[PDB]
Amino acid sequence: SAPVVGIIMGSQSDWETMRHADALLTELEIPHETLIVSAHRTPDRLADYARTAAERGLNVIIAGAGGAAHLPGMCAAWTRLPVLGVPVESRALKGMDSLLSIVQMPGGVPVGTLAIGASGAKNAALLAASILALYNPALAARLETWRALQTASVPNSPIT
Amino acid sequence: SAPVVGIIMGSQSDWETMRHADALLTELEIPHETLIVSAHRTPDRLADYARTAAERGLNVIIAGAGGAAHLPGMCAAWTRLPVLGVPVESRALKGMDSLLSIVQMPGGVPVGTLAIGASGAKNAALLAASILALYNPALAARLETWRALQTASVPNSPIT
Amino acid sequence: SAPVVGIIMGSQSDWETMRHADALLTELEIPHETLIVSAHRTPDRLADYARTAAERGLNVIIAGAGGAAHLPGMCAAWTRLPVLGVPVESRALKGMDSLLSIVQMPGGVPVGTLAIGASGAKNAALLAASILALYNPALAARLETWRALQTASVPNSPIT
Amino acid sequence: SAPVVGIIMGSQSDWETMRHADALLTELEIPHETLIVSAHRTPDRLADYARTAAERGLNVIIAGAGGAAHLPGMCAAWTRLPVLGVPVESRALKGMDSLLSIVQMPGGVPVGTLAIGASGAKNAALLAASILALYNPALAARLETWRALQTASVPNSPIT
Amino acid sequence: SAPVVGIIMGSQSDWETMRHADALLTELEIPHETLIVSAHRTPDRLADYARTAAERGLNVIIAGAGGAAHLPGMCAAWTRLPVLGVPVESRALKGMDSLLSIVQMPGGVPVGTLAIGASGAKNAALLAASILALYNPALAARLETWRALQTASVPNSPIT
Amino acid sequence: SAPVVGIIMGSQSDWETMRHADALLTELEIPHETLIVSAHRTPDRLADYARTAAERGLNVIIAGAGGAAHLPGMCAAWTRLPVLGVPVESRALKGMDSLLSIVQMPGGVPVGTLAIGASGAKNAALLAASILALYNPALAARLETWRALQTASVPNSPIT
Amino acid sequence: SAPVVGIIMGSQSDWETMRHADALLTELEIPHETLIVSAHRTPDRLADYARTAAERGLNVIIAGAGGAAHLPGMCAAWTRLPVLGVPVESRALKGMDSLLSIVQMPGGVPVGTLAIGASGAKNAALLAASILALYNPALAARLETWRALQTASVPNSPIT
Amino acid sequence: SAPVVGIIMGSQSDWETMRHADALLTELEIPHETLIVSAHRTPDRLADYARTAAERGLNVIIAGAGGAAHLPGMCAAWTRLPVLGVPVESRALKGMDSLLSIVQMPGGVPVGTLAIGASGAKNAALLAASILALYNPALAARLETWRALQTASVPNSPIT
């Protein structure tokens, strides 16, 4: 089935983080593609990917990178689609550089930014799901189930 | 004319920032409502607003607050809709508390976060528009026009 | 015996930190309950817990969470009881996000915030004790003993 | 009329902030004293103030200071009473030095810390009131009224 | 008279800072061009500017931007020329977002980064001059004179 | 021989850091005492230590602590002697809390602050030595030798 | 009348801060010299100033600079005398760059660092005085008087 | 062959980082020297190195250090050559101190600063290469090849 979400990441080293977005989309049965695209090492690959995303049928892009993390913002520069940004935890600055590089977009070109690291990757996929759910009733019910199970599954007290 | 986006903010002092989201939605002809909801002063008002948003026909919530900024995250706790968070600039810490208290959502409850301040409010509205544009071709055409005009309006050289 | 302190925490993963509050309360023989309550994954569980805390005989609530740590503040939103907040050390940002999310409450809804991590969990319990001690003479004497033993036990010089 | 809360601050320059704690205690009819005590300029005055607070009938101390803000922690060192700390905003570092030097107390000597600046001072007074309200029903009723009014006074929409 | 340095900046608001680079290059008689290029509003203009810089005879690019500052890094992605980045001071975060989003380039695509603000713009021009001075003896002599004058012009004592 | 430097530290856990000050003083044959003194757990022990330091023949105090690190400043509050402060690396905030708690002393009561961690402990001892050297010619020559050996011993190129 | 303290600063813009060190030394009758020395604009002037300070009869150097503040550390590199560093507040980063670039000296070359800004300058002078007071009884008596007056001059309550 | 790039570093402990610059220069066949030079422990060694660099035929200096990292800036103080600075990751502050110490140079004496850590060391060498490439066609072609291989080698999708 044709992908409706693109997951892109700046490097293989981001995969340990971005796999959490991939897994969540698969759990909810959201067809998606998962690609490496570097804003800096493959800038024309990025331009082409972002420019053609909509005509290819993508609805949402999830972009993850670390450091001077420009992949989400430059993707949003070329697509009208919603772009969600995952700050990957960097070694020295723990993703604060990633976070500021992604979230602080000037007015005109948005990136919806999620938490640093694996939680943000998971939430980027959930956010993409909640967007798709607006016009896909079956997916909306599966998302409702997912959220209900999350809530119901929280224990009442810690295990010691 | 029925609202499809809800803009909520923690206080009147947030309006100087959040008015930019309001203006952009009006510019793009996106029907919306604009409210004050305090996560800490009116927690039950928030619970009811967020719980009922989808059945009231809202598709996206834009939530803005500053300091220990819980409004977006708690909104997202109670709705299955996409929630976008605007960190309002705070006096002492310049919105860094706003930013971290909004963006660092743990796995399972996303908030799509935008830049600190007016830029973020503007971009929350643009991000909401790009979401709605996925299943509204007239709006998609208006957003394309808007993006194209932004691109065409950048000058080639500075004024000295 | 009926609990007079509630310890609540956002997740099982917080228990490694919050167990230090539990242990201290037990050492001082302060009856207490220890629960998982997520502001974001179980928001109605939190509303109910906080709303009914006083009528259930609780005097003080100790709430711990990490990241966008909204559990203490949203608990204080619904209870008139004093709420003490423990910032749990987060992976990337080392609890700075937890700290700012908890301590930077706007005027009107306070959270008494303790240090990031285990020391804060221990001190949240000691602070709760010092509050209860105001109207429980036996506990006040046990707290006096605890503080005296802490002081007396500090060695005069390091072991090499 | 005998004070049950002590407000102490490191300098006259702290009063612009700490006056908000004073006002709120008066509003709630909580008898209190308001003093300047410098941890570094009058360390013996501090030792004596804190040592004797409980026997003088104080139940809670609210301590405010900025920069390397030692006043709350050293107060807590010498009293068994609950000490609440207000980080006063500093010129260069905007109260981040105030905050960290107050909140990061090691295990065994708590300071319940509130927000940087006026909000924190207000909330220290509210937190002190919620503590006293535990064993003062008239005050508990006044605080409930106060909280309920805060909730009722939040508007539903912003003014443009 | 053909330009050997390109100064590019993300917006007119950057000119207050980047004008210092322009002035210093003129002072040292380094022919240059000064343009506005938005990484996010005119991404294809940027791609073309950077791709073609070397064949147009440019030797160094000085790029200035603020906030999530992608202009220097994306310029460097598309040119083999040395790119120098000037972090423009931002309103809320004082150029710390500018700084981290410029300097933290991952391995393989350098941006030589200068100080936040006017100093950085001035120093980008001086750094560009020292680069050009390597294979331009007349310019090398002008730069030596400039450095020597800077050294000679420092007073020996302050004015009171 | 009577100690002329006092090393004091807030806890046994600081010794891993403060031993570097001890070792340096011993290397230079500077008689000294090494003690645990907690500002918060043993405040009267600190008052007495600092108050009597000068009459006991101490010339310089080196004080190390972590977190809300008030030991150096409160020591300086009671002694006219120069106090040097060593920020101990804390677990969560890596000694930034220690650093700000120590260095940001208001005017009137100084603490000469050294680097976070072991380097600062070593340098506190070297700084104390350079102070004593002003009026002890033999020690001054041993310090000169120490500095000369440091300089001479730096290799010219790295070992691979 | 021969100077025993040298105050050096990187620029005239530093004088607004460093004048407080000058004033305090004059108040305590400590003969001193006050100079501008730029670590980066006059590196050989600095080398010569620092190399020769001890033979010229200086006992302590107070060095102030802002931004990438190398003046104190490089001074300490070339003198065996105690060097005290004053972080001058910087425009964008509020002296945090000044602070870290002064205090974080690696092992072997100390700089005793004081607070950001005017407080630090004042305290550098007081710290220098406490050093000199060790072997100057008349000065020791003046400093005691000064400290005692500071203590006596703290008011007991704020002015409203 | 005579070196045209000097790599200098403050300590053997920096070599784990700076070896990445060495390796890159060797890969591109750029003759270079690799030296330890401490700004603080060997200040005259630094003065001499920087002063004579140009007359020795060096074109670019790459300087790496950590903490109060003054090596790059003080090198630039004495040479007219372009100096590139590599912030070495420090233990406590993760190279934020290194970064600010290097990048925040006031106007007049530039250091082109690269990312914290190994990526910055690699990029300092690439930046030096892109400078040399301006007047060495063979090297320019080898750099073009290097950049082309980097781009071409990025995989299209992650390995799981």
Ligand SMILES: Nc1cncn1[C@@H]1O[C@H](COP(=O)(O)O)[C@@H](O)[C@H]1O
């Ligand atoms: N910002 C960016 C642009 N292209 C890649 N990156 C990022 O560079 C970091 C390191 O990549 P690598 O490990 O391949 O050097 C990764 O987090 C990746 O997102």
Ligand SMILES: Nc1cncn1[C@@H]1O[C@H](COP(=O)(O)O)[C@@H](O)[C@H]1O
């Ligand atoms: N803020 C919040 C709300 N609900 C849970 N959390 C926090 O999310 C973090 C991670 O939870 P988990 O490990 O279950 O993902 C924990 O520190 C927990 O307090």
Ligand SMILES: Nc1cncn1[C@@H]1O[C@H](COP(=O)(O)O)[C@@H](O)[C@H]1O
């Ligand atoms: N600030 C302070 C006052 N008394 C002790 N500390 C500090 O508390 C930290 C932790 O002490 P402990 O490990 O005993 O809890 C140590 O760095 C010690 O200097």
Ligand SMILES: Nc1cncn1[C@@H]1O[C@H](COP(=O)(O)O)[C@@H](O)[C@H]1O
């Ligand atoms: N800033 C500086 C001046 N001279 C050496 N350093 C730095 O000091 C740190 C620690 O050096 P060492 O390990 O030898 O103590 C290294 O990062 C080195 O660049």
